Amino acid sequence: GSKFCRFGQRGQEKPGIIDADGNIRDLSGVVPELTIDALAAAKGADIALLPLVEGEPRYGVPVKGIGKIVAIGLNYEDHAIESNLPIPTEPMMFMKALSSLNGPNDEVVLPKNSTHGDWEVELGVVIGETCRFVSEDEALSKVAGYVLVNDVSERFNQKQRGTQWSKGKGHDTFCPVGPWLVTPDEVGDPQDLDVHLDVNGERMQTGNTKTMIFNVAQLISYVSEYITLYPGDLMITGTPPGVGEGKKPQAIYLKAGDVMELGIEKLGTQRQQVSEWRHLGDEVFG
């Protein structure tokens, strides 16, 4: 067993594992919650003895207890070329507000009066062991698994209200994560995964993680010199070309009624409906 998930309504999710047929099996008999500490027991469990889940439940964020999210800026060489930007010599880092975390298929709500909402399919890395000044040679051994991410962005809030990108990155619902935490033995080389994203069934982003400027090991090593990564932390590693902001002749942005569909090889798929802003009340996402 190498694909883990969390299923059910928000705030009520249960731990699960994806069997060889693609069905969810309930892990509640083995571990109470899918946390990083629970991975060893969930990885050792006998799948054929776990009950099948009924009712076609919602996928939640596949790991409970993500403490913070570190985000990487320009990190695809073919993206740098398409934007006519220089190759960064060290990775741009910014924080992806934890309150943006959402389920993989959950509704994406555009911010108030937003006309610059944008998509960013990204490889997410979930840390398994504390990363504090870790060498590049040892970095990948600190990884618990990989996840599919959409780094949803508001380009006006990101770039036209100051120099700090996080202002356009932390909105409610702007970090769909999942549906699977896939352990490294199943993922293989994280630097050979096909990546894609469509909007309304029209392909917008195509790439492969081989063209990352800083690979996952380089990113973990660098980040750990500035910000300690603890088990459960998520790092989102940048996006290939094809974001709406870069479309020619004119940029293309998200609008109400759009449907985003994205996937990364071995990490499953996401589908989000995009809705216009409304006041989301006392809802606590994640």
For Mg ion, the binding residues (CB under 5 A) are 120, 151, 239
In angstroms, what is the minimal distance from the CB of 198 to Mg ion?
Answer: 18
208: left (phi over 0), alpha (psi -120 to 50) or beta: beta
Of residues 6 through 45, those in contact with its own copies by CB under 8 A are: none
Report the C-alpha gap between 47 and 169 in whole angstroms. Answer: 38
Yes or no: say if 45 and 88 are a contact pair by the CB < 8 Å rule: no
87 binds its own copies, rule: CB under 8 A:
no
In angstroms, what is the minimal distance from the CB of 65 to Mg ion?
Answer: 22
Q: Mask: binding to its own copies, 100-129, rule CB under 8 A, as x and -?
A: x----------xx-----------------
165 binds its own copies, rule: CB under 8 A:
yes
Angle at 213 (CA atoms; ends 130, 92), nearest 5 degrees: 65
36: left (phi over 0), alpha (psi -120 to 50) or beta: alpha
Report the C-alpha gap between 241 and 202 in whole angstroms. Answer: 15
Q: Which of 160, 194, 162 is nearest to 269 (CA)?
A: 194
Q: Which is nearer to Mg ion, 151 or 198 (CB)?
A: 151
Q: Is 136 helix (H, G, I), strand (E, B) or coil?
A: helix
**Residue 165: which of its own copies, Mg ion, none does it interact with, CB under 5 to 8 A by kind?**
its own copies
In angstroms, what is the minimal distance from the CB of 266 to its own copies?
Answer: 29
The span from the first CA to the last CA of the chain, in angstroms, equals 25
Of residues 133 through 152, those in contact with its own copies by CB under 8 A are: 133
DSSP 38-86: THHHHHHS-GGGSPBP-S-PPB--SSS----EEEE-S-BHHHHHHTT--
Yes or no: say if 172 and 109 are a contact pair by the CB < 8 Å rule: yes
164 binds its own copies, rule: CB under 8 A:
yes
Of residues 44 through 83, those in contact with its own copies by CB under 8 A are: 67-68, 70, 73
**Residue 120: which of its own copies, Mg ion, none does it interact with, CB under 5 to 8 A by kind?**
Mg ion
Q: Which is nearer to its own copies, 44 or 281 (CB)?
A: 281
Q: Which is nearer to its own copies, 146 or 165 (CB)?
A: 165
Residue ranges in contact with its own copies by CB under 8 A: 67-68, 70, 73, 88, 90, 92-95, 97-100, 111-112, 130, 132-133, 157, 161-168, 170-172, 225-230, 279-282, 284
